[PDB]
Write a protein that binds this ligand. Sequence first.
Ligand SMILES: C=C[C@H]1CN([C@@H](C)c2cn(CCOCCOCC(=O)N[C@H](C(=O)N3C[C@H](O)C[C@H]3C(=O)NCc3ccc(-c4scnc4C)cc3)C(C)(C)C)nn2)C(=O)[C@@H]2CCC[C@H]1N2S(=O)(=O)c1cc(Cl)cc(Cl)c1
Length: 107
Amino acid sequence: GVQVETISPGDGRTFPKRGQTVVVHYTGMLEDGKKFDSSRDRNKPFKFMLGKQEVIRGWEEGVAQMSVGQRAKLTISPDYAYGATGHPGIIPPHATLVFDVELLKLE
Ligand SMILES: C=C[C@H]1CN([C@@H](C)c2cn(CCOCCOCC(=O)N[C@H](C(=O)N3C[C@H](O)C[C@H]3C(=O)NCc3ccc(-c4scnc4C)cc3)C(C)(C)C)nn2)C(=O)[C@@H]2CCC[C@H]1N2S(=O)(=O)c1cc(Cl)cc(Cl)c1
């Protein structure tokens, strides 16, 4: 599944709703601890629309469990990410992924 742990609290009340655009900063790490992606390098937040399934399942479900302003650690099992095959050259087969995610705004 996806586990969500608070690093810094959000407002506790404003949770993403289906069809809203979710605006975040993130860093993604493998189980070996290595960073494979981050929006922070780009100085431009990442945006996705909740419900479009245009991010992996653990994001669709995990970021929906965050309140605006929260920074959270998401631990995502392979079946909620890239599964048996992974994404060759980037994500190993059957990989658990760890993200540091900050929910900046909803639009
Ligand atoms: C834009 C990066 C996100 C990649 N994804 C989705 C969109 C994804 C895309 N892909 C296709 C293979 O992309 C490998 C490189 O990913 C980094 C990247 O910048 N991708 C670009 C990308 O996907 N973009 C650029 C824009 O942000 C829009 C987006 C895009 O084309 N989205 C369409 C799309 C494509 C595939 C999927 C998939 S495939 C399996 N599940 C899904 C949901 C869902 C939606 C690129 C393909 C145009 C170059 N596989 N997964 C994530 O769900 C998750 C969660 C949100 C943040 C990123 N990840 S990730 O950090 O786990 C990640 C980073 C990298 Cl360097 C590589 C991977 Cl495989 C995963």
